[PDB]
Every structure is written in structure tokens, then in C-alpha cells.
Subunit: 422 residues, 4 copies
């Protein structure tokens, strides 16, 4: 896999100097070719989905894997949107004049070579390739075996467009072998890859962090908690909860726990059960709320200790009764994965305290937790949602793949031994 | 060492909720006590220098270890300057209104618990503690054995000033034992330390990166190249080179390799030798420049292949003759540590090309390479000079120790299933 | 007065090129000399206050005119705080690379010659001179006839410091004649003064705007309205109102009208009357609130139609009963002078609506209207509060006195006849 | 005209609260309808151009008045580019937490009502209307006699789209009376119009600045000077000058004076004459430079003392021999209108000095003065080029029509009488 690193590193230097016009031309050709060859991508995706059904995969899993003509048009529109954004490379962050006469400034520069290991999803390949081309980084892709056909078809189109536009062929490359030894080999190619983006569950992150010598920005799993305060409107809160849970349960920003204040549990729980029975979602309630939720039409079962720390990725929910805001904050800190947390309330003080005392990557007040997306946050698209602290956090835009560089200009200036200041 | 992380984590939560008033009060008390206890630090540092000098330590190492009273006043002034900087915690990076009606914004928040492993220098302890206190991070310190007395004396005052203000004791703590097993133990405390800052040579960085489970911002070694173009003024270039080399040769942002254009070598080299003979710097010259430098009064010897990738940390310099700008750029890319690089020229095109094609953390045009400092760059102080590309780069200041958080406010807003855009 | 403008214009060109070190030296010397010569300023101010009191000046007016050693130390501290701020001249606002290869950026530059006509206050002279020196603008001062001795002494001190530091003597100059013919003469010197800052009442603003040929940033009069919602805590709202009204009633950011919701008035008014009787403030209640406030210990009188549109500048307040939030917003739009408006409430929706729908220079939620100050808002000091919409708004700091300038660099770039875009 | 202001003021309040979705819908519908009704606009423009030639209009003026189908497609593309820009309304400029505990921030808000008095050009109406709709301001338009038909046709389409989208009909309105009494009447409507943007020559600006009570952002006239240094490449400088002069000489950002260094004059003038004769531009040379230019094929005539202070708006140029850089800077300051100035040189020191010492809306180094455009500078479109210093400067984009507003939120915070600081 050494030649992979050689090809990526050599292509990165050429890419870093390309003007925005060439990158925009490549992106526009990519979108046009994507829309042109819909019949082959759709056929390959449908065949792969049918093959996946033969292995008894979950319905939500197939829905994530499935690609419709509407989804193809949506990803083409996202490519055009990222083409329409301003190029972050070359932008000036800040500047000034020092007391010694030196003109200082910071300019954004491309990262270099980016290696991404991502889950079985077709659109993520296109999104990553488009973002890396627009920013000016050489990317190396490696996805799950489930999306082998769609990825093999889309990378061919991307490479053909790259050849057509005259850009070096090593800019965007992928690995087709589903072997996991190649992943371990890639994890050790530190001299080529500058930063690695793994998207997956706990096992992939454990294996990567165990045998990594490259900077890693973990996508991380998501356990999103929603806290219902004592003073809140039942009708509005139920709609927000339904939107956060039912719509696309297979994602990561879906709510997994529902912390309910003990003062409002008298009337909120019976209405929640009635709504959830229509929604058809099993409630893994706590012992305290078991008595209240037993009479509800929605089916309810006792919760286990380990159930709080993992995602259901289906129509399931955890119901816990807390004493006050401090208890909910402590529980969120203890069991949360720092992905997304929202509070539904009518009190200003409680909202401010929750915003201040919660360290999740995104905090919402009277809003759904499904807003944690690259497109929803105003950015063109996202490669992953960062749950770590270094470099980017939350959704990743064009800025997340760029670093700055100090530039100084002077008239043969020399640093003085004694730096006086006022 | 588990209690170390427990105390640091417990103190970080309380620290992140403080206001600028208490932090500024503690910083001002720190500066006042530093100026009010000059004799203790002075005598401890003098005793440590006397003990270390008896072990054959290099003169520049003693100069780095020495603490002139003027230097103590300088570090007190730097602390007071930090006290005068605007608090970066709570600042809003950007914001806006989304299409769905959500009000979005990003706010700076403290990183958490910061572990540092620095070289034997007395002022770094004070600078790191002051910056971490101002930002709001709990810091764990571990320095070299050469600075045991001075570091103990300083940390005593720093810990004592915490009690006088009511802040928790676990805010600033250090490890006194120079045992290297404790360093390996700290490297594995991932659940408490959020980010590690190692400052040192190649061996320490290799050891850390080999057994690191914590995000690491490497200080990195410094090999700084200075390029001399065909069209340049000899008198000013000589002064710039002398300022870059002679002044404090024991630092890291000191030029180590001199790249001289072949067209200007015949006139530049004889003057360079005459100027450098006064400074006493031994010129490790290439074979091509050996003939020109032999006649010069300055001491000149042949250079070895491995000598190009190490810091002399003394009054030494490497002289190499290159063909044109492309050769110098290739050599800088091949043998550079991406720390600092400067070009001396009178051609606009060459200057722009050098700024564009060089990926060092700092690039200067007609200026010294000694400007890569926290104080010089406009920041209050620096913890280290980052050479990597993730998170911060170049000098690291108040902003480099803070991360951001998305906050969204709505009125029971729910994400639409299909999102149109224009 | 032509020589006045000639000297100011000549001094501005030299000032714009000065470095931050020289400006900081001048500011530090000014502060040191101001502290050294405290007795002369104190004696002159005391004599002027005694002379003014012989003319039956108001107690609040005298307090505004009066200066104490604590106030002198405060203005010295504000001068030093200005000296400690970063120089805004030469800073880069934003930059980038265009599609045609042109490197574009914006750099802050000084405005030029600034003329200011201000009320009889002693500290405004010092603040204006310090800000103009720090930014790099030549200033012309013309104060009220009341503050003659103090302004003359301060101007003499500042001119002596300017002479000592070697800066041109035309940088800071003032007109001592209280004749208003010269004021009309100054309004027509368009070829020298670049921007005018009048501070005063309606008469001065009308006179200036009637005969102005120079850009004007009107200070404007201040009619600040406070709205009390139906759901609010009485104890906290009463303290906020007391702080907003009683403390320094002679300013401009003091509440003059109290809009009370009709649903809460029955309980709010009796407590407000009890508090205001202790505060000793006459209530100019409306007809609707007259019945409720008649039984209150606080003195209450009927209000007049014209009383809503002017400042009392004393211990007086207007009480009006409104139906709902829309009525209060309409009244604020009709009678407000767009200076400062605050709402006290416990409802999130009402707070957001009030923030969105009120076009004032500053809007507060559950806070006093006395925060509209340069020092409070995080800036060093303020020259005036701008109630207009052009250029700066609200408090005017260092960045309010600076303009930007586009700078482009290219390699003999030429604009293409047809500009394609993507 | 009172109903005009009444309708504009009523529409402004409703427009300020509109979300970006509705504004984008209106802009997209406007662009689509402009594309659909190309034939009517083309016919009206052709008829107006033919009628203008009956009055002997200048060829450059005719070209400016002429609207080819390609120009119509271009303005539709500019509208669609505006529709793709981020909405500046609601954006946060900066923020933070104060010492007293108040969360401050600044949010952009629409200016209000904007009155535009522009020249005879058909594409300006579309751009002004699109920008005012995108920002959220109500606009009042007043063109010239030569564009009485095309502007009416465009306004009909814009009003039809406004009616279709359901927005208030008073948002965009115009006056179709060439009577100049109405202009003077509009200049005095201070209670409705918040800011006026006049575009024209000296007479219109004198008339507006003589009788007006509204803030004015003057477009001004353009006298762009180009300085040729001693050391410069002849061919590249000649190409840059040809691009700046020949291409569209009817604009404002076109060079009208050539400042040539005396040292390079002998080797530069004959080549300039040879190129200039091919260009066909007449050279209004100075007496000193007349001897060299009297032999070249290009037509040369003596220059008068008043031609230096006005635009030729045709194929004419001024040639003057300066002593050095200081003389050129003095001449530029004396006779320049602060619109655009460029320097062609190969010396870094001279370039930096020229950038620092020259005050203009835009300064270029080795570039063309034809880049001073809204589209070229990265903005979607421009309403005018501001040569003044208040509010915006240079090209005026989307953010130029917006102002900010301080917002503060606290928990019943009250200002303290004594404000401590560190
Ligand atoms: N934080 C984010 O931004 C984000 C985004 C998307 C998804 N997610 C998370 O993704 C999870 C579900 O993903 P999924 O359905 O694709 O299942 P998964 O098991 O999390 O997927 C793991 C991914 O890595 C590969 N992989 C798995 N085990 C591996 C190993 N031992 N060595 C190397 N590679 C390995 C998988 O392909 P192979 O099995 O063929 O090797 C797949 O590409 C959820 O927990 C969700 O929260 C997070
Ligand atoms: N990039 C930057 O910002 C920056 C800043 C300052 C200095 N530097 C670099 O510092 C270098 C010189 O530093 P120095 O004179 O102090 O020598 P050094 O050998 O680089 O210092 C290593 C530091 O780590 C410790 N250390 C050494 N070996 C270790 C090991 N195996 N395991 C754990 N800890 C270990 C040392 O104390 P013990 O030996 O007692 O363990 C000392 O504190 C230069 O190369 C310079 O460029 C870089
Ligand atoms: N918006 C702000 O930032 C701000 C700041 C401070 C004060 N203010 C306002 O200041 C007002 C009170 O100021 P004040 O007590 O000094 O009374 P004032 O009558 O408003 O003061 C007018 C100022 O201009 C001068 N002046 C008055 N009439 C003039 C005329 N016809 N032609 C030329 N100059 C004239 C005055 O000195 P002479 O009378 O000797 O000419 C004085 O300097 C309040 O309404 C307050 O809101 C506003
Ligand atoms: N700085 C900029 O951004 C900018 C942009 C475009 C153009 N310009 C300048 O525009 C000038 C040429 O413009 P132009 O060819 O249209 O000629 P002009 O005479 O400058 O045009 C004056 C404009 O105002 C009107 N006007 C003229 N005299 C007036 C008066 N006494 N009262 C009221 N309105 C009056 C004209 O229409 P009526 O004559 O029918 O009244 C026309 O709309 C050049 O100097 C150029 O530099 C500057």
C-alpha cells in the first residue's frame, strides 16, 4: 500500500496550488456526470439492497442502504451546493501590524492527505470526494462490504471526471478489498496520511485508537438525551419528541433517552404513552415510571443498566425520572457521549443553566436533536460529526479540513533583545 | 496517580463556570506574590544552576537555565499582560438564523484537563499555569530533573495563591518525581487528561507517540532554513542572519541551515565568512561552498549527511549551495521540520512563490526566524510552538487552549423531512 | 479658522503613519501627567462648580459638572485602559484570493480630522483626546461655556505632553471662545473636517443638521422605555427599575417611561409606589394608572401629551398602562428615540418577539438600561452614543473611528472581458 | 410624495421580519420572469437606444445604454448569484460575556428605506431591486430620461413578481417623472428615507449635498491615477495600461492620468506611443513629456491645467512626468478623487510605501484599476462605489446595506456604581 501513499502525497502538492476555477469545474462535471449516469448507480444500489435483504438485515438498515431517484437528485444538489460555496483556501483569518514593523497574518491552507474509513452508505463517498476536491486534499476511501457495488461504480465516475479535467489521477482513490488487514496496514501509514476520519460503532473506534499512529478525529457513537422540564407545553413537546425519534431512527443524532422531571410526570407520561402507541415505539421505562406507563397503550418493558449507554438504532426509547435539573445534568455527564442534548422548557433560568453546564457538541433549547447535520447547520455538506475536542467539533464543513499558516513580511526586520511593551 | 486525575477532573468543572473577575484576581495575586518573593526563586535557581554547571552542562544550557532578576521581572510582566487580555471563554465565534427558524451560534468553552511535559526551563511553569488559569483548564505539570528546586518553589507559590481566592486545590498540580515510569503512567490516563502538550527533542516525542492514548499536540524539534536569493542586499541579509543565529542559539526558532543561491554565492560567501568569524560560529559547509569558504577567516569544516536534520543548539551553521528557488523549496520540503522558514530577496515573484509553496508553520519574507514567539506574535504568552497540523499551529496562545460548542435556540422547531434550498 | 483646519490636516498625515509604540508612549505620558497635576484640575473644577452653583444650576446638573479625586483617578484608569487596548489601525478585516489571481484584503485606516462639539463635562475632553490619539486622528474640540477652566487646563496639559513626545503640535487643538458664531463657522469647514460628533440636546442637533456640510454622527437625546410583562417577578423588577432610574439620573441612558402590562398592573403598581416613595421620585402617571397610584405614598401627578417625548433629567418617571406586547411595541416605535429599551419578563416567546421587533440601538432582556456605556460594553471608553443608523451605532469605541481600505496585489493581472462564474 | 414615503415605511417593517426562504423565492421568480420576458426588454432598450442616437449621443454612452441579449443573460446570472449568497440579516458580528454577567452580541438588521438616484443604465435597476429585496429594505428608484422605457418595463416585472409572491406592494416603487422638482422634494423627505445613494457626476452630487437632510453615500466621480515606477517590465505595464484604458472607457474605474517616473520615461514613452496609436487613444501630454511623444505615431496634444481634475469618459489619457514616488503621491493626493490608484513596479519597498501612504477606496499593486467592481471583488453585485469615508467604502455589497444592533440578556442584572477592572 506504499504506492497508495506515494500517489496521494504527490497529488496533494499539485492540488494545493489549483485555483478555485479548476476545482469548481471538476465539481460541476462531477454533478453533471452523476445526474447523467443514474440508471447504472440506481441499478447497482438496488441489486446490493436486494442482496442485503437476503442476509436478514434490519429494515432501518436497508432504508439507510437504499437509494432512490429522489436521493440521487438530492446528493447531486448537495454537490452543486458545495460547488456554490466560497473556497476556504487562501482566506485570511486575521492580521495586523506588530510593534517591530512586521506585517502578520494567517492564511488557510489544505490539510494534505485525508484517509477516511466510513460505514456502508452510498452518499458519503460522494460527499467526502466532493469536499476533499473543493478544499484541495487528496483522499483515500475505504467503506463497508455492504456498499461495495455502489462505491465501485461511483469511484469509477469520479476518477473518469478527474481524468477528463486533467487533474492528477492520484487525487481520489479507494480500496475495494473488504479485508480488515488492509485497514490495520493503513492505520500505520503515518508518513502519508495527515488525518484519519473513522465513522462507525464502538468496535471500529476501539480498534483504530488501539493501533493508530496518525491523528484521528473520531466520529463517535451518539447517545442523545432529551430533558423535559417541569414547566413545558405537552402538545409542543410531544411533537418535538416524535420528530426526534420516529424520523430516520437509523441515524446517530436520534434521541435515545428521555429524562422527565418528576413534578410533570403525573400528566406527561399518560399522553406520551398514547402518542408513542400510535408511533409504535417500545418504551424501556425505568422502575419509577413503570407504574405510570403500565396502563398506557404503548408496550413498555423494564430497562437494564447497560441499556443507557448504547443506541437502539430502531423504534425504542429509554424513560427515566429525575428529581431536578441537577440530577439530569449529572446523568447526562455520566452516560452521555457528548453528541447532542436538548431541553424543552418555558423557564429562562433553567435554559441558561442547561446551556452553560452541558458540554455536548451541540445543545438545543426547545428544538429537535435531528438538527445536528452539515446541511441543516448552513454548511454545504458534512464528512462526519466530531464528538472529540481537538480540531473541529460537531458537524464538519469546508473549514474543518483546513489549517492556517502564519505569514510575516518585513523590511529586513530583526527581533530586538529587549521587547518593551505598553 | 488515579487521585491526580480525579482531582483534576473535579476541579475542571468548577473552573469552567467561573467568571473573568476571579481569574483576573488570581492572576494579579500570582504576579504580586512572584514579585514579592524574588529572593526564594533567585537563590533556588542560582543553586540549581551551580549544581548543574558542575555536571559539564553546555554554556547555552546554563544560559537557558539561568534566571536573571530582570528575567523574573519579565515573567511577572508577562503574567500581568496575560491578566490584561480579554477572556476568550464565552466569546461568540459566529452565528445566524437558519431557514427552519433555529438561531445558531458557536461559543468558546474550556478544553478541560490539560497535561504538559516540558523541558527544564523555569518560566514555562509560570506561563503554563497562568494560561491554564486564565482559560479555565486544570493543568498537570511534569518537568525535567534539572529544574526541580525552581519548579517546586514556583508551584508552592502558585498552589498557595489558589487557597487565598477560594478556588479548588486540584486546579494546578504537579509531579515532583523525575522517574520516567510515571510519565508512561500519565500517558495512559485517557479518561482524565483531555490533551497532552509534550515539549522536548525527538526521543521524548517518539516515546510519547509510541505509547499515547491521549490526543497530543507535539511541540516538535526545530530545523529552520533561510534562503538567500540572487537579488538581495548583502548588508541587510548579513544583519538578519546574525540576529537569527547569534541571539539565543539555544532556542528552537534559530536558523540551522543556510541555503545560498549559486548566482550570488561568489559575492555573498566571502562577506558571510568575514561577518561570521567575528561571531565565532563554525561553518559546516557543503563541498561546493568549501572552496569559497576556505579562504575566509571563519572556521569551516565539511558537513555530514545526517547533520542536515539536527539542531546544533550552539554557535554552528550549515551552508549549502542550491541551483534556484525550486531546488531550495525541494530541499526545505525534504529536510524541514515545518517550524520556520525565511527568504531574503528583492523580487516580488520569488517572494510570492516562496510564500505559496512552503508549508512551514511560519513563513517570513525579509525577516528573522526569531519572531516565532508567543509574545512577539501579539499573543500574551505561549505554552509551546505547535508543528503539527491538527488543532492549533505555530505559537499556541489563549485561543489555542479553547474549543467551541454549537448552541441552537428555537420555538419547538422540528426538522422537515424534505429540505428545499435556493 | 482656516489655519485651524490647515494645521489639523497637516498633522493628520503624519499621525496616520505613526506606530503603536509612539501612540502608547504619548498616552502613558498623558496619564502620568494627569495624575501628577491633580491639584490644578481639582481646584479649577471646584472653582467652576462654585461659579455655576451661583447661577442656580440643578443638583443633578451640578453633580455631572462636579469632579472628585475618585473621578480623576477613574479617568486616569480609563486612559490607561485605552493605552492597554490593541491598536485597531492596520488590522485586517478579511481577505481572500479572487478567481483572476488577485490577492484582496481590507485594512483599517484612520478617519482623518475629527471635529467634536460636546456638553459641559470634564472627562469627555480627556476621553476624546485619548481615543483620537490612539487611533491616529487629529481632533478639534469645542465644549460648553460652563467647563471653561477645566477644559483649558486639560488641553494645556495634553498639548504639553504632545510637545514633549515630539508629535506635531496640531494633533489636538481646541476653541476657547464660547461664541456660537464660530460653531456655525466650524460647521462649514468641509474641506478639513471629515466627520463631526455633536453631543447635546434637540436644539444643538437641529442647529447642526440645518447648517451642516460635513458628515454628522448625532449623539441624540435619550428616551429609554422599560416594558413590564404580565409574568415577571416583582422584587427583581423593582430593583432593576430603581437601579435604572435613581442611579445618576442626569445621564441619557436613564429610563423615562414605564410601560406596565394591564394584567399585572393591579399588583405591580402598589409596590412600585411604595418603592418610589422611598426613592423620592415623582410619578407622572397616565389617567388609567392615576386611580391605582393615587393611594400610593409616592407623589403622583397627571401626565401631559408632550411629556412622553423628552427627558426629565431628574427624579421623574412616566407611567403608562398598555394592553399587550403589540401596544407597547407600537408606543415605543412612535415615541422612542431609538436609544435603549428593556423588557422584564419570564416568557421566552415574548422576549424573542421584543428583541426581534424593536429597532433600538440597544435592547436588553431582564437588565437595566444603564448598561449602554463604552466602558461597560467591553470597549475602553466612548466618545458618544450614536442613535443614528449610518456608520457606528450605540457606543462608539476605537473601531468606530476607523475606516477600511481595499488592497489588491497581482502579477500584472488584467480583468477579463467576460467573467465566468460557478 | 407623502404617500410614497408612507407606503415605503409601512412595507419596511413587514420586510424586516421576512425569512430568507421568502426573499429567495421572490428573487428566483424575478430572475425567471426576467428570462421569460426577454423580448419586451430587448425591444424597449433597442427603441430607446435608437431614439438616443437621434440626439447625437456619444458612442461610449450608447454602448453603456445598449443592452445586448448577452447582457440580459448576464444580469439574470447576477440575480441568481445574489439568490445564492448567504442572508446577512440576523448574522452575529461578535459577542461575549461581560464582567457584570451580561451576555452581549451584535446582530445585523436592515437599514430601512433606501432612496436611489442613479444614471441612465438599465442593469442598475435590477441589481438595486434585487439587493434591497435580499437584505430586507424598501427601495425608491429615480432614473434618468434616457432610460424612461427600460426602467419602466423592469419595474413592471418586479412589481408583478412582488404581487405574485404575496409581499407588500410598497416594497419596490419608482418615479417616472423627469421633472427635477420631484428630486428636490425627495431630498427633503427625512422622516421616511433613512439613507440616499446618488450616482452621477459633479452636478448631481453638488445639488444633493447642497439641499438634503438625509444621510448620503456619494458615488462620486472617478479620476484613477496609475504610477509607473523606475524599475518595471515594459510589456506587462503596457498590457495593464491598455486593459485599464481601452476596455469599456465609459465607466468610472478607468485610468485618466498616467504618472511616469523621469528615469524610466525615455525608455517607456516611445513604446507607450507605439501601443497607444494602435489603441487610438489621444495623449494629452504635459509640456515636459511633449518632446518624446511628438515623434510617436499616437496623436499628442498639450494638456491644460483643468483636464487633470475630470474624467474624459472617452479615448483620452493624461501623461505627466513626476520626479519620484513622493512627487507622485503628492500629485495623487492633490488631484485625486480617492477612487482607485495603482502602481506598477518591481521594488518591494516602493510598493509597500505606496500602499501605506495613499488613501483611496482601492489600491492595487501590479494590477488594473478595472477591478473596482462588486462582482469582481467577490460580492454578488454592487449598488454603487462609495468614495466617501462614512459607512461603507469602495464597492457596496450586501453587508453595506445593513447595520448592527446590540443585544443584552441577563438575570435581572443591575449596573454597579463602582466598576472594578483588571
Ligand atoms: N458520529 C458520527 O458522525 C456517525 C456517523 C455515522 C454513523 N455513526 C455510527 O455508526 C454506527 C452504525 O454504523 P454501521 O451500521 O455501519 O455499523 P458499524 O459496525 O458501526 O460499522 C463499522 C464500520 O467500520 C467497519 N468495521 C467494522 N468493524 C471493523 C473492524 N474490526 N476493523 C475494521 N473496520 C471495521 C465496517 O465495515 P466492515 O464491517 O465490513 O469492516 C463499517 O464500515 C452507529 O453507532 C452510529 O451512531 C456515527
Ligand atoms: N517546539 C517547541 O515549541 C519547543 C520548545 C522548547 C524546546 N524545544 C526543543 O527542545 C529540545 C531541547 O530540550 P532539552 O534541552 O530539555 O532536551 P530534551 O532531551 O529535548 O528534553 C526532553 C524533556 O522530556 C524529558 N524526557 C527526556 N527523555 C524522556 C523519556 N524517554 N521519557 C520521558 N520524558 C523524557 C526530559 O526530562 P528527563 O530527561 O529528566 O526525563 C525533558 O523534560 C530542542 O530540540 C528544542 O528544539 C521545542
Ligand atoms: N446621546 C448621547 O450620547 C449623549 C451624551 C451626552 C449627553 N446627551 C444629551 O445631552 C442633553 C443635555 O446636555 P446639556 O446639559 O449640556 O444641555 P444641551 O443644551 O443639550 O447642551 C448643548 C451643547 O451644545 C452647545 N449648544 C447649545 N445650544 C447651541 C446652539 N444653538 N448652537 C451651538 N451650540 C449650542 C452647548 O454649549 P453652549 O450652550 O454654551 O453653546 C452644549 O455644549 C440631554 O438631552 C442628554 O440626553 C446625549
Ligand atoms: N462612483 C460611482 O460608483 C459611479 C457609478 C456610475 C457612474 N459614475 C459617474 O457618472 C458620471 C456620468 O454619469 P452620466 O453619464 O449619467 O451623467 P451625469 O450628468 O453624471 O448623470 C447625472 C444623473 O443625475 C441626474 N441629474 C443630472 N443633473 C441633475 C440635477 N441638477 N438634479 C437632479 N438630478 C440630476 C441625471 O438624470 P437627469 O439629467 O435626467 O436629471 C442622471 O441620472 C461619471 O462622472 C462617472 O464617473 C460614478
Amino acid at each position: 500500500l506504499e504506492q497508495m501513499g506515494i500517489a496521494a502525497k504527490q497529488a496533494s502538492y499539485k492540488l494545493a496550488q489549483l485555483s478555485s476555477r479548476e476545482k469548481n469545474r471538476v465539481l460541476e462535471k462531477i454533478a453533471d456526470e452523476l445526474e447523467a449516469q443514474s440508471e447504472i448507480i440506481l441499478n447497482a444500489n438496488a441489486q446490493d439492497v436486494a442482496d442485503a435483504r437476503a442476509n436478514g438485515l434490519s429494515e432501518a438498515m436497508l432504508d439507510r442502504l437504499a437509494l432512490t431517484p429522489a436521493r440521487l437528485k438530492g446528493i447531486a444538489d448537495d454537490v452543486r451546493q458545495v460547488c456554490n460555496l466560497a473556497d476556504p483556501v487562501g482566506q485570511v483569518i486575521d492580521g495586523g501590524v506588530l510593534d517591530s514593523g512586521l506585517r502578520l497574518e494567517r492564511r488557510r491552507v489544505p490539510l494534505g492527505v485525508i484517509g477516511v474509513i466510513y460505514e456502508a452508505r452510498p452518499n458519503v463517498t460522494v460527499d467526502v470526494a466532493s469536499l476533499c476536491l473543493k478544499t484541495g486534499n487528496a483522499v483515500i476511501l475505504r467503506g463497508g462490504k455492504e456498499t461495495c457495488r455502489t462505491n465501485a461504480a461511483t469511484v469509477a465516475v469520479i476518477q473518469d471526471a478527474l481524468k477528463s479535467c486533467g487533474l492528477p489521477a492520484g487525487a481520489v482513490q479507494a480500496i475495494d478489498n473488504p479485508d480488515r488487514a488492509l485497514v490495520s496496514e493503513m492505520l500505520r501509514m503515518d508518513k502519508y496520511i495527515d488525518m484519519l476520519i473513522p465513522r462507525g460503532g464502538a468496535g471500529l473506534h476501539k480498534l483504530c485508537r488501539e493501533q493508530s499512529t496518525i491523528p484521528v478525529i473520531t466520529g463517535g457513537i451518539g447517545v442523545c438525551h432529551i430533558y423535559v422540564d417541569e414547566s413545558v407545553e405537552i402538545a409542543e413537546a410531544l411533537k418535538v419528541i416524535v420528530n426526534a425519534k420516529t424520523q430516520r431512527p437509523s441515524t446517530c443524532n436520534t434521541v435515545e433517552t428521555l429524562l422527565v422531571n418528576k413534578n410533570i410526570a403525573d400528566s406527561f407520561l399518560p399522553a406520551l404513552s398514547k402518542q408513542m402507541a400510535e408511533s409504535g415505539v417500545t418504551l424501556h421505562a425505568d422502575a419509577a415510571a413503570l407504574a405510570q406507563l403500565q396502563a398506557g397503550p404503548a408496550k413498555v418493558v423494564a430497562v437494564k443498566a447497560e441499556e443507557y449507554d448504547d443506541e437502539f438504532l430502531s423504534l425504542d426509547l429509554n424513560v427515566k425520572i429525575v428529581s431536578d435539573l441537577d440530577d439530569a445534568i449529572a446523568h447526562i455527564r455520566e452516560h452521555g457521549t457528548q453528541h447532542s442534548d436538548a431541553i424543552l422548557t418555558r423557564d429562562m433560568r433553567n435554559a441558561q443553566r442547561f446551556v452553560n453546564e452541558v458540554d455536548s457538541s451541540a445543545v438545543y433549547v426547545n428544538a429537535s436533536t435531528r438538527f445536528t447535520d452539515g446541511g441543516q447547520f448552513g454548511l454545504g455538506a458534512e464528512v462526519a460529526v466530531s464528538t472529540q475536542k481537538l480540531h473541529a467539533r460537531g458537524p464538519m464543513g469546508l473549514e474543518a479540513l483546513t489549517t492556517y499558516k502564519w505569514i510575516g513580511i518585513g523590511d529586513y526586520t530583526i527581533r530586538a533583545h529587549h521587547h518593551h511593551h505598553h
